[PDB]
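Narrative progress, year one. The postdoctoral researcher (J.K.) led the effort to move from monomer predictions toward full complexes, under supervision of the PI. The following entry was the first complex the group processed end to end, covering 116 residues in total.
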Amino acid sequence: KETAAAKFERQHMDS
Amino acid sequence: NYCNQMMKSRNLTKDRCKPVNTFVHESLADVQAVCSQKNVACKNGQTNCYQSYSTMSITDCRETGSSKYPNCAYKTTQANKHIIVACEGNPYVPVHFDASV
């Protein structure tokens, strides 16, 4: 599934 | 608004209304870099947390009091603050957003 680091990205990153 | 749209797009409110969420407007490498900056304790009392030396552009999304699924509603608050993240793994990268000061 989606790793914790990948989830952090989908949820908080908006460069 | 931005929060309602971004929360939907990122699969955060498609199956429920997430109370709060923060979006950082910096490059992914610049945020990953925080994991080697100021070490601090996490709320829970852990110590794998780090505070950024500088402030970053962030957008806070807060659910209105009247919000209820499927009609989720968000209050958008733009700001510049120091972020605090919890890091783990190899490479050592952020896995949790602790807060913004």
